[PDB]
Amino acid sequence: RRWSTEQILDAAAELLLAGDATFSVRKLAASLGTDSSSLYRHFRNKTELLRAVADRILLSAMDGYRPEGDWKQRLTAVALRLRESFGQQPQLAAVWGRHGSGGTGSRLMMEEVLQALRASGLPDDEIPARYHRLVILISSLITAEGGQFRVAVLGADPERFPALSHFAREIRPLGADRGAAFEEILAAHLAHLEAAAP
Amino acid sequence: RWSTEQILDAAAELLLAGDAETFSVRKLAASLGTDSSSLYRHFRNKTELLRAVADRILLSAMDGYRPEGDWKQRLTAVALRLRESFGQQPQLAAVWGRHGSGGTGSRLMMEEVLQALRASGLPDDEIPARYHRLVILISSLITAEGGFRVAVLGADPERFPALSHFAREIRPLGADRGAAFEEILAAHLAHLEAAAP
Numbered sequence: 124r125r126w127s128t129e130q131i132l133d134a135a136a137e138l139l140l141a142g143d144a145t146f147s148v149r150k151l152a153a154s155l156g157t158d159s160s161s162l163y164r165h166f167r168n169k170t171e172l173l174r175a176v177a178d179r180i181l182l183s184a185m186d187g188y189r190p191e192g193d194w195k196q197r198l199t200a201v202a203l204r205l206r207e208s209f210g211q212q213p214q215l216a217a218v219w220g221r222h223g224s225g226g227t228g229s230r231l232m233m234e235e236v237l238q239a240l241r242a243s244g245l246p247d248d249e250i251p252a253r254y255h256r257l258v259i260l261i262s263s264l265i266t267a268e269g270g271q272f273r274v275a276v277l278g279a280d281p282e283r284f285p286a287l288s289h290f291a292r293e294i295r296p297l298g299a300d301r302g303a304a305f306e307e308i309l310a311a312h313l314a315h316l317e318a319a320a321p
Numbered sequence: 322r323w324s325t326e327q328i329l330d331a332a333a334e335l336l337l338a339g340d341a342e343t344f345s346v347r348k349l350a351a352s353l354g355t356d357s358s359s360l361y362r363h364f365r366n367k368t369e370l371l372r373a374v375a376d377r378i379l380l381s382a383m384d385g386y387r388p389e390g391d392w393k394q395r396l397t398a399v400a401l402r403l404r405e406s407f408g409q410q411p412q413l414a415a416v417w418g419r420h421g422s423g424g425t426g427s428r429l430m431m432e433e434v435l436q437a438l439r440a441s442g443l444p445d446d447e448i449p450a451r452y453h454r455l456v457i458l459i460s461s462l463i464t465a466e467g468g469f470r471v472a473v474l475g476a477d478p479e480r481f482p483a484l485s486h487f488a489r490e491i492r493p494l495g496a497d498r499g500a501a502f503e504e505i506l507a508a509h510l511a512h513l514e515a516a517a518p
């Protein structure tokens with residue numbers, strides 16, 4: 124009568140959904156009918172527990188993934204799946220964006236990114252560095268998005284700030300339109316990789 | 322009684338650096354012999370105080386700025402000043418990234434980024450969207466950054482044949498952030514150059 128680490132992590136993922144933002148080791152233990160001291164047989168500590176749960180989110184992101192389309196379509200598909208999976212998991216998004224994860228979810232995601240980068244023709248020697256920048260970009264955008272007021276132009280002298288005064292009515296707040304910004308920034312980055320590929 | 326200016330100058334001293342602990346309103350309020358809620362009321366709400374503090378970081382980032390070089394160089398110079406200024410202030414970077422900062426620091430930063438984007442030759446109608454994407458990029462990278470080794474300890478070569486090959490050479494996600502900031506920004510500006518007429 125004891126849960127696997129996998130089962131514990133999956134219970135935690137669900138608890139972390141509906142917050143807010145509530146989650147503790149005590150609550151997790153109680154949901155499993157066990158105690159906090161027993162859970163820590165599974166995880167060195169709470170940040171190791173949270174990283175391990177963030178891995179489960181990668182794993183589900185990759186749920187039912189098939190590598191269709193060209194290398195750029197594949198990298199875009201993975202980036203979107205990751206963004207969607209983290210969409211309702213802001214806390215885990217932060218943990219992953221900071222530490223990454225070292226389990227099966229990370230492995231499946233990494234395997235596809237790396238196969239896609241090989242598919243592009245980029246030289247192998249360069250792939251780990253290309254990988255590193257690509258995942259830093261995707262993760263950084265995902266952590267920032269998940270976590271009205273006075274706008275900068277209001278009261279600005281139009282002679283001191285002509286460009287700002289000219290544009291500021293058309294400028295969107297930094298927190299608005301984040302889904303489109305994600306896709307456009309990602310596409311820009313993949314165009315850079317394509318330009319670098321033979 | 323403290324005044325607005327006094328409070329923000331006090332917050333700027335707390336930011337100004339070494340030690341420069343992670344800023345907190347509660348620490349600022351204690352230092353000022355007042356209380357956090359009183360400071361929030363002074364500024365309307367907690368968010369507007371945190372934005373005003375973030376604006377001082379932007380004001381700092383822009384201080385002494387003199388444009389030189391081409392529009393890409395100017396955007397890069399601004400990006401690097403921002404990353405340096407927010408270095409020890411992850412919470413305030415996230416406030417900026419989510420809400421903007423609202424004041425003279427933002428005005429200075431925005432004016433220079435917009436001028437440089439006008440200088441790229443991109444059509445005037447696109448400039449606000451180009452701005453929004455670029456500053457989302459810069460702020461997101463900074464927010465994620467401010468807080469021998471591998472990401473994964475090998476991998477089953479049957480299930481993960483590529484990763485098994487590369488595993489030793491893949492660094493953990495948080496390594497080498499500064500270099501990555503510069504390369505990623507450069508790739509984005511290279512896209513803007515390619516799109517420009």
